[PDB]
From a paper:
The first NIS synthetase to be structurally characterized was the achromobactin biosynthesis protein D (AcsD), from the plant pathogen Dickeya dadantii (formally known as Pectobacterium chrysanthemi). AcsD catalyses the enantioselective desymmetrization of citric acid via adenylation of its pro-R carboxyl group with ATP. The resulting enzyme-bound homochiral citryl adenylate reacts with l-serine to generate the first committed intermediate, (3′S)-O-citryl-l-serine, in achromobactin biosynthesis. Structural and biochemical studies have characterized the first step of the reaction in detail. These showed that AcsD is a new member of the adenylating enzyme superfamily, with no sequence or structural homology to other members of the family.
However, growing crystals of AcsD pre-incubated with ATP, Mg2+, and ethylenediamine showed clear additional electron density for a molecule larger than citric acid in one subunit as well as density for ATP and Mg2+. We interpret this density as (3′S)-N-citryl-ethylenediamine (CEDA) and were able to refine the co-complex. ATP, Mg2+, the protein, and much of the citryl moiety of CEDA are in the same positions they have been previously observed to occupy in other co-complexes. The difference in position between the citryl moiety of CEDA and citrate in the previously reported citrate/adenosine/sulfate complex occurs in the regions occupied by the carboxamide group in CEDA (this work) and the pro-R carboxyl group of citrate (previous structure). The carboxamide group adopts a rotamer different from that of the citrate carboxyl group. If the carboxamide group did not do this, the ethylenediamine moiety would clash with the α-phosphate of ATP (and AMP). The ethylenediamine moiety of CEDA sits in a shallow cleft and makes several contacts with the protein. There is a particularly striking bidentate hydrogen bond interaction between both nitrogen atoms of CEDA and the two oxygen atoms of the side chain of E442. The side chains of R501 and K563 point towards the ethylenediamine moiety. Structural data show that AcsD uses E442 to achieve this recognition by making a striking bidentate interaction with CEDA.
Author numbering:
A (entry chain A): 3 to 588
B (entry chain B): 4 to 182, 184 to 572, 578 to 587
Amino acid sequence: NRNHDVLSRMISEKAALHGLLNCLIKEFAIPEGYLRYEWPDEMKGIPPGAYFDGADWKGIPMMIGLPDQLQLFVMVDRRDTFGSQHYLSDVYLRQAQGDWQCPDFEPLVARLLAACEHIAGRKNPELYEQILQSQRLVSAIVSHNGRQRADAPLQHYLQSEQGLWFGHPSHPAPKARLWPAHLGQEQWAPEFQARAALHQFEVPVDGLHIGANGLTPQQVLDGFADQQPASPGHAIICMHPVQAQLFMQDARVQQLLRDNVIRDLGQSGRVASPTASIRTWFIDDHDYFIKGSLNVRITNCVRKNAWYELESTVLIDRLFRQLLDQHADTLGGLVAAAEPGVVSWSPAAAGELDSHWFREQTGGILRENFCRRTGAERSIMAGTLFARGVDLQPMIQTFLRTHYGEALDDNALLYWFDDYQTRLLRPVLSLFFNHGVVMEPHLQNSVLVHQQGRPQQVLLRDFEGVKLTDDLGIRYIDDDIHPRVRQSLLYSREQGWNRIMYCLFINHLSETILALSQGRPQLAPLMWRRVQQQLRAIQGELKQPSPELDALIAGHPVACKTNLKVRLAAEADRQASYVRLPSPWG
Amino acid sequence: RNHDVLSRMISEKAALHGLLNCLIKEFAIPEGYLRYEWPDEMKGIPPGAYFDGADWKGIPMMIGLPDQLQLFVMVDRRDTFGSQHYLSDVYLRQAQGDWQCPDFEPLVARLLAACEHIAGRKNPELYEQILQSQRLVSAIVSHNGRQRADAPLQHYLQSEQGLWFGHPSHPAPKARLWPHLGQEQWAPEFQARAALHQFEVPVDGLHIGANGLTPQQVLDGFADQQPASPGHAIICMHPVQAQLFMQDARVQQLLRDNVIRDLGQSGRVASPTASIRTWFIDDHDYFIKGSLNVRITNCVRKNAWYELESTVLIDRLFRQLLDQHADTLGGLVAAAEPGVVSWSPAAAGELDSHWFREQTGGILRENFCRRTGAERSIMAGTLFARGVDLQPMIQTFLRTHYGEALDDNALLYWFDDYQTRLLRPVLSLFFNHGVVMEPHLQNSVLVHQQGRPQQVLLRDFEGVKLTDDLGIRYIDDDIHPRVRQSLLYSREQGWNRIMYCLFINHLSETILALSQGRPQLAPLMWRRVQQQLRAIQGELKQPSPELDALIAGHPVACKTNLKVRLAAASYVRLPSPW
Ligand SMILES: Nc1ncnc2c1ncn2[C@@H]1O[C@H](COP(=O)(O)OP(=O)(O)OP(=O)(O)O)[C@@H](O)[C@H]1O
Ligand SMILES: Nc1ncnc2c1ncn2[C@@H]1O[C@H](COP(=O)(O)OP(=O)(O)OP(=O)(O)O)[C@@H](O)[C@H]1O
Ligand SMILES: NCCNC(=O)C[C@](O)(CC(=O)O)C(=O)O
Ligand SMILES: [Mg+2]
Ligand SMILES: [Mg+2]
């Protein structure tokens, strides 16, 4: 206590800062050539213990020269073309002709953001308050969770969803969840092991829109809510309780409640636990996750399911089922969580705009609870797998050492990594080049299934992000689908490849390698070399041309989605959503 | 980036740690200026100084100094003797200011001023001695960066050459002011070798002490006597002392008149040891110790006539005690000093005669490596020192010998064996015989068998004193009063030196070195000291009230090196570890 409060705070500040640094380095410093691995000519202001341990340098100096004559100095464990490194010192800043200084968290955040706002020519004070608000939540999170082993999040599936203490490791405000403050934060936060009874409404069956593959409409309904309380001619639907509050602000909803067309049944649904995506709920031993709309910003978008996404979910689920059934030999060993049921409600007499609004508000998706198959103690969300614990150390190190009974030598780490990366790259690249199916295989859409620590599967999830290429993938959907649903699913071959590149190498594998190679940066080139060899090998298996894979293998730059830059640039500035980072090889 | 900058930074950290040791032991602890507490206000202290990402980097230590000056540093342990590992840079704050981390020279200046204020006294040369000491350490680290950091522990002479940082609680451990002669040619830390300087002198001016050796054999131990003409002998000297010697008008006269002959650097090629003016020759029966008119740590390292005489008497006493009373000596291992030589003109007046004798003074020390083995014998100061990477060298030394990382019990058992072999002989000699050794780190040599402590050899008869109530009775009534005076300590003076040397200078450093990364082992080690003291007391043949009081947990005398140098040897008291 008290000492625990300062400590939790300092831990949250270091973690939040490291995420902000990640963004600065990946999105600005590297692509625009502001970064040098050099010592400042003058060090005044920087204390000897920042960079010298008594025998040797604490890693490699990193200097970033920014506008307004601002320079940043920090010590790092490695040079890395993707901006993946461990920071071995406090951040020092020097302004024009002043000395090096070490600012407190808020002033440091302010100055770094101001620098990026200068490069952008645009300020975003909302983002600034979100960075601070995210850090404050993380402080409460660390303070709440200082009880267990630092690697406890890796021991059970739900604990792995709950134990992403720090969130997206390269986002400026990973924990900012933008719903009315009076609704509270901790009540909804997997990081506080949140549980709640889902909110329920009773609605007339004539406004239901049910999508179902290998289930009856009634089984889809049952998957969300027990239908017993429903009167004849009605069904029960469920909703995030925050969403239900948002939903009921609307005049159209107020009118239906007043006219007794729908009934508000309160928080009377299944008691369930939010996962890391906040609006998807886990129930131990239920056949399904419940994914609902939440019309709120979390990281870089509003977490609502648009009507055409509710429609597209059904088609994509149907597609994956046919691919796994008839085309297993061109899917690279794909393991994916199905999304067999979708529900939404709108009043039957509603015009199109109101119908669409109602369907987005009430939209729900059933995802196969894979833990029934894979086992709760064998399944770990990959973001948490490659994350830092409450002690700010990669949790994977002790997880593996426990499972392997001993300290893993270089070979054991390389071998583990090889098993991990093949299971990720093969299904994704096979889907993309053979069938034009664009997954979004970032860390949160990926779940490691393991056997005594050893990788068996990388299960992939989230159909709502899945796209189909103009040249290959889009052929797989009917001619008679709504034009808007088609538009929703359609990506160019190039759009698809940019997303796959970022998700696979920068978001996912780069974090994999950084976590595994902590204390041993020399392993990173070797791991990336194994990736390059794996790509060459997958290319051999492919049934369709893969010129994109040629260029990547040949060392051409890799697309990197921005998380900070997008929030500074105009919404109309499409270019700011990506940058290019040098290849790990060449 | 450079090894030059790294070396400077290593030397500055070493030098500063040594200075903190003095501040904490000599001032902060006995005067109650020390608190293990966090400052209410941390502004200026960066997070990384005290916080590693998960926890605090040890324990905060605060010291309140004069004129509203405060010092902050993180340490690995609370320690009543002031023995801790420093885990952060030092931060200073004065008056209405923020915490600040000054460069080395500004830091030394501010800390020295504070100590000048607490002490009242000022030594104008000290500041420059501190800096010159740090600069030499920088050159030393720079030169010695190719070896395994624990190389100094592999061979006796390497242990003597490998005390890179010197006395660990001294403001200027490596301060040496040579008359245009260079540091490196005389520096053990640069593996220096030189032929000794030699003079042919007439035998009528010789003063030779000899025990178990003839006067001629003593002569032979210093120098091959073949080149000497009839009625003459060859003596040797430090080459630097030889140059200083010959700058004297009295000496130039004798040379001009051909009474003595300068034979140049024609003597034995030898290697200076850690003490600078004692030379080692592998394969020779003797070290050669000579006078040198240069200050090294606290003393100008020259030996006066009565000190030359007392060496002979002490050597004779140790032979008497071993011949007749070995069973009350506690397993004593000591390097004999069987020969002493000096020369002065036969005609000379007392004043001149004394000057010449001190100038030409020479002592033979038994080369114990002949019986203990060069690869088995390690000077204790180096054994418990930090290597060029500032890691305690004993950790890797022990690991290699035990074939594995030593667990807690292994360290504890090694320590127990070590401390018993130190404490027994020293306390037996003091209590049974009134003989006061000076068993500090440089006067002790571990003899080990595959790393297991066998004996702690003690040396340096010049340091040996005899108590007024017991030891001095071994001195015959026909001894010159000045020689008896040089030997005499009060029983209380004797005990304070023994206390300081055994527990604070020596075993505190032993424990600190062995227990890096494991501060919890310290009190356990200190508890074994206390148990061993009880055991030893039971063996004693004479009253030991002083030992009762020590076992009982009463304060321990600590010699003040910084104050000594500020003064240009008083004792403070430090709380018992038990
Ligand atoms: N490394 C990461 N990369 C991407 N998203 C991450 C990462 N770590 C945590 N997240 C979080 O996971 C969510 C990912 O968005 P995505 O659209 O893939 O999930 P969803 O559709 O909201 O939910 P589900 O995966 O349950 O369908 C976001 O809330 C994001 O903040
Ligand atoms: N921890 C230590 N305690 C005491 N002296 C030390 C220590 N470390 C290094 N020394 C050095 O060892 C010497 C100790 O002085 P002392 O008077 O015992 O030796 P000496 O008579 O000059 O030579 P010798 O020991 O060779 O006879 C000094 O040069 C001193 O700087
Ligand atoms: N006979 C006196 C000679 N003793 C020393 O010279 C030892 C010491 O005083 C150091 C010390 O005692 O800690 C020094 O100045 O290095
Ligand atoms: Mg997702
Ligand atoms: Mg000595």
